[PDB]
Design a protein around this ligand. Structure first.
Ligand SMILES: Nc1ncnc2c1ncn2[C@@H]1O[C@H](COP(=O)(O)OP(=O)(O)O)[C@@H](O)[C@H]1O
Ligand SMILES: Nc1ncnc2c1ncn2[C@@H]1O[C@H](COP(=O)(O)OP(=O)(O)O)[C@@H](O)[C@H]1O
Ligand SMILES: Nc1ncnc2c1ncn2[C@@H]1O[C@H](COP(=O)(O)OP(=O)(O)O)[C@@H](O)[C@H]1O
Ligand SMILES: Nc1ncnc2c1ncn2[C@@H]1O[C@H](COP(=O)(O)OP(=O)(O)O)[C@@H](O)[C@H]1O
Ligand SMILES: [K+]
Ligand SMILES: [K+]
Ligand SMILES: [Mg+2]
Ligand SMILES: [Mg+2]
Ligand SMILES: [Mg+2]
Ligand SMILES: [Mg+2]
Lengths: 428, 132, 426, 132, 132, 132
């Protein structure tokens, strides 16, 4: 009697990965045609909405290829939010009936609201992006770029049609803020959007604990990242020293927001100070919300571990958040995800250094971005070797579904009839 | 042809097993997940649901079923309330299992078509088998 | 709440500040140590990290080295003794609690000291057999005693300019030192369990003893094979050595990484795939109730086995046919996560204060937090804030794991509980 | 206005839901964490605590709240102890639910200010409602 | 020789400690985890399991062991159930501890091979001991 | 001048409180850590120990104490065995608190110098208080 949520999660991704991979090889979608590994990498990047590119999205793909790319990252981003919310609903249904045996809307309405929320969010971002690019690029081309980037931003994909992804719009508030708002709400999570939508009149105090965590941790994650990036890169001529005072803050805020899974870059991370790469690595690992279009280990997982640590250092018996106790299984889930993620990350970084030769900071940054699904590159993907591409594909797949799958493994372990005696192991 | 069994205890599971052997579609529904899994291999469709919930009974279109058997024994109030909800659901034939004489009185007045008392009913037959 | 955390910190700071104020005196140093340098040396000796802002053999006098043996002896042996004593009191309180619901400490301390003295005497004899012929009847004996004490206490302090790089091809000294910190880092609980119940067999040893006796050979073998594979073709570290020399060097680094801190090769010229392996080895560290450091092998074993249990969706973490209770798994995972958080903060602070590549800063931070003290060329150029950060990291690294383990054991009881609510993860 | 309700059974949760619907901030305290969870959904602050313990009641700072409602029904000993501790804490107004006349007299002697007998008071209310 | 001892009371732990002291491998099974921990110190393998559960016994592979000793004392129902399940699992020799002459006869009917009455047999043994 | 109290229930804690207030050395010993912590503020030295363990009683130099009070009430075997161990340890005067008459008879036959039965003795005392 073990849970089957893990199997639905993997089969769903691979059930779309393989069809997407074979389509990209056809010359209809590529001007030159993609090899099997390149198409497998591109499909995995699109389906996981990582946004890593072995080839340039704007140039190597045709008009039909970009339309396919929008479909893949809409399936990868909104599809995870739709599936994760669907599996969350069924988990609650099983839990609710279990309580009644011992002692809410239907699924269709929930799925309709998720797709409705996605299209309206993209449509709002669509008109703002159209408002600027249509005058510059014409009508027919202007709407396409607005639609491609609004879909990419909401799905936390980071795919861009420009050679340098949004590096020409560092000093453009309308493009930066429209994109920033898109993956912030796209990455916030439908449970947070839904709870605020139905219970805002009650007040912040009566929102669900998960909603309160996401509504508080996200601004601090944005604010701390914005201040830290600005402080560490204000004097760096190569990235932010040449911008105006407002331009620096706009760039610092953009990368602070884009790190949490979007993957767009107003500046060059290739020329970032090391103390800034370490800050962004932490930001990428934390990721977006739990039931959103993108994410890494997720904000709530980091928040529980952050306050579990604070509880442990103060020797308190219970982990408390917003006058609510976080039960020990939840704490174990959050700590296990971080430890398991580090185990896979360390193995992936070690393999990358063997297949291709690069510095540790370049390898570590690329491994985190692929695992955290952010897709920000520090120059490793440009020179990635053939075996390195295979590792990145696996890391992108595991990083996309790992935290969610491992959570459901912890939720429903296989029941057993044989238990061994408890014995103590010394730790510390 | 098409039957529904609510409550998958010892009595209810026995109904499901014999009904399947005669090649009939049986909808086995029980609040407890473990009991539904036991009948999952003996019925056409096994569903975990609370048949005291009026909207749940509406979704499970029990009016389409020829006969509905309520086999809830321990909680007298659930069997009485589930019987009523099945009546407003449009079920023409409702068979209810009752463990006590007082429960069998209430079920008769609320409209159950057949009241089954396994101890009393088995008592009569076992005597008849003893006689012949 | 438990006072084990308070006894652990007060005991360290009550030997660090005196040891620091003594190191400033010119009797112990040929040129004298600054307050920052003396504090760094005292922290490295008492925490037996082995990191050096000044050369041990040159900058210290004859009396200074005798103090250094006393300091690292106190660090290693006293940490082992205090851990055993606190474990004994924890067991006593647990037993009395069990009786309420439903050996001697002096003898234990005597066995700890006598085992240390016997091991150090064996290492001293083996080292004297090799150094006395070429160094004299007085200086060779001193070097043998110093290096045996350093090896057993998992300190890594060396009297040579290059710490054992001249004996990469010498098997006698390499195996003598290797056996000293493997046994010194095994844990006195394991040594006692093997000493008292070896006739019963391996099957009836305590679960911790089995975990150590299996993982330590596995960790040593994995480290040796990985270091040999990754560094066999590197001319600057192991390419010039013979086939036996390469394996001896690989085994020596695999063992020294687990807290000793001696180096028969240059880690400054190591391939990055090998520095990652050595970082992983340093983080794991030595045994729980031993002279070494790290997250400890038992913690890494429970997390590795818990991970396998979670990936297989099993209900219980089972090790050697014994269930590992959920508080133990939570302790191990919390130790790893908190260690990672402090490590990330320390690397960020070092990167702010000092200008170096990420691999060097990360390696130095891991070596100082784990008390291995292996240097990758960054300690020699430490600045003043860098030295302060390293001192803090060495202090927290030495006492952090055991302290955090005991906080999880005895949290403050409460009279107010808030309702349980679910938080989405992953 | 700040209210504290101790015991979250049928009466206690009904008082809390009414008090919070009327715009007042209520504290819900119960030893059964299961019932504290339903209250926490709509109650300003819900706490799992034992209110017969002097130190626990001191931690709750019940003297801050204007009125303290003690709705412990089944355990008369717990009701008496909670009323005594609340009065010794220094709360101005204590309302206690009593299911017996003898318990009501004991609570009057303890120092309870308003004592509610739900069965008898509801009987009087229902009789008046039927009359008019 | 491999022995399985079910139930780790005063009798079961004495049989395990005597069997293991002679070099035989013993499997100790009990539902109380405290007694399984206590036996795990000296017993070759100790397992927390419910031996009245027929699927659990198949996992223990009691058919492999030469002799199975069932030392469930207080719960007579569990004693007969464990004897029945062990016999149905294909155990060659089942030794059962019985606290009464009526339980012993039922165990004889079930298929127990050797039945031990601790009070009566030890009484006979001490009576012989005083004589000689 | 120097006294020992074993068992820190309501009776033993009262003995410790009066003895220390009068100005004497009192070693309070109880297997339960909570009661030892409660009495730690009052007595000169409070130790968590099992006084049924013979080696623990040997380590605690109870023979140096002028009087030893054994105040274990719930488990009669614990009180009897503690009295025996204290008498073997060389304690010249042992005062034991007994709750039942059979326990008092056993303790008298063992050799306890003073047997205290709180209910009977306070019965006599309050009767004398009522008379005058
Ligand atoms: N509201 C309900 N909806 C569906 N099934 C129910 C409901 N209440 C009880 N049942 C089921 O009805 C069956 C009747 O079992 P019963 O004889 O009452 O108890 P037991 O299983 O202890 O013998 C059980 O399997 C029980 O889970
Ligand atoms: N010491 C206590 N402190 C707080 N709440 C208590 C205490 N003792 C009992 N309660 C709670 O007070 C309530 C009394 O209601 P009760 O009559 O038991 O149930 P109901 O009203 O639902 O039939 C219960 O929720 C009970 O758990
Ligand atoms: N169904 C069962 N399966 C396995 N062990 C059982 C079962 N029922 C009881 N036992 C164990 O058998 C042991 C002997 O029972 P009992 O005679 O009550 O204890 P004691 O012999 O110490 O008086 C108990 O410790 C109990 O845990
Ligand atoms: N073997 C023992 N050694 C020391 N103290 C004991 C032992 N057994 C019981 N006690 C203590 O003696 C005290 C007296 O118990 P009891 O008379 O039952 O008081 P209460 O009814 O308040 O628990 C208990 O609190 C218990 O902690
Ligand atoms: K992305
Ligand atoms: K070291
Ligand atoms: Mg039944
Ligand atoms: Mg009530
Ligand atoms: Mg027995
Ligand atoms: Mg008492």
């Amino acid at each position: 009697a073990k849970g089957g949520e893990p199997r639905i999660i993997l089969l769903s991704f691979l059930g779309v990965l393989l069809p997407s991979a074979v389509l990209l090889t056809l010359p209809v979608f590529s001007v030159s045609g993609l090899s099997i590994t390149d198409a497998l990498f591109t499909a995995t990047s699109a389906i996981s909405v990582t946004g890593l590119g072995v080839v340039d999205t704007g140039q190597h793909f045709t008009l039909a290829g970009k339309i396919l790319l929008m479909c893949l990252m809409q399936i990868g981003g909104l599809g995870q939010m739709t599936l994760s919310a669907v599996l969350l609903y069924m988990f609650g249904v099983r839990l609710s009936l279990r309580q009644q045996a011992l002692a809410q809307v239907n699924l269709r309405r929930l799925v309709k609201k998720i797709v409705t929320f996605a299209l309206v969010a993209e449509a709002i971002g669509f008109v703002f992006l159209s408002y600027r690019w249509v005058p510059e690029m014409g009508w027919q081309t202007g709407m396409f770029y607005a639609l491609f980037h609004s879909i990419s931003a909401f799905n936390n994909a980071g795919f861009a049609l420009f050679s340098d992804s949004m590096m020409s719009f560092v000093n453009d508030p309308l493009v930066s803020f429209t994109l920033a708002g898109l993956f912030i709400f796209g990455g916030l999570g439908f449970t947070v959007i839904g709870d605020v939508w139905r219970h805002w009149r009650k007040g912040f105090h009566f929102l669900h604990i998960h909603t309160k965590i996401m509504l508080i941790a996200t601004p601090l994650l944005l604010l701390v990242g914005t201040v830290l990036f600005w402080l560490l890169e204000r004097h760096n001529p190569n990235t932010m020293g040449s911008l105006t005072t407002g331009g620096q803050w706009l760039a610092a805020f953009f990368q602070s927001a884009s790190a949490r899974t979007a993957g767009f870059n107003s500046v060059d991370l290739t020329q970032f100070t090391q103390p800034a790469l370490l800050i962004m690595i932490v930001l990428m690992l934390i990721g977006a919300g739990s039931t959103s279009t993108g994410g890494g280990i997720k904000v709530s997982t980091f928040a529980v571990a952050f306050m579990a640590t604070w509880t442990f250092l103060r020797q308190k018996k219970h982990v408390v958040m917003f006058k609510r106790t976080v039960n020990w299984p939840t704490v174990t889930k959050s700590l296990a995800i971080i430890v398991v993620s580090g185990a896979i990350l360390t193995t992936a970084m070690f393999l990358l250094m063997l297949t291709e030769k690069a510095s540790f900071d370049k390898v570590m940054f690329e491994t985190i971005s692929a695992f955290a699904t952010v897709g920000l590159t520090a120059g490793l993907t440009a020179e990635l070797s053939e075996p390195g591409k295979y590792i990145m594909i696996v890391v992108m797949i595991i990083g996309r579904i790992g935290p969610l799958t491992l959570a459901y493994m912890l939720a429903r372990p296989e029941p057993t009839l044989i238990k061994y005696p408890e014995d103590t192991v010394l730790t510390g | 042809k098409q039957f529904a069994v609510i409550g998958l205890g010892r009595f209810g599971l026995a109904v499901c097993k014999e009904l399947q052997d005669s090649g009939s579609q049986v909808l086995a529904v029980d609040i407890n997940e473990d009991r539904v899994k036991e009948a999952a291999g003996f019925v056409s469709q096994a569903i975990v649901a609370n048949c005291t919930h009026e909207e749940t009974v509406a979704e499970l279109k029990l009016d389409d079923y020829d006969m509905v058997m309520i086999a809830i024994g321990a909680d007298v109030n659930a069997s009485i309330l589930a019987t009523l909800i099945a009546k407003e659901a449009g079920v023409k034939s409702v068979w209810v299992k009752a463990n006590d004489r007082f429960q069998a009185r209430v079920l008769q007045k609320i409209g159950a078509d057949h009241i089954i008392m396994p101890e009393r009913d088995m008592g009569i037959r076992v005597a008849r088998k003893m006689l012949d």
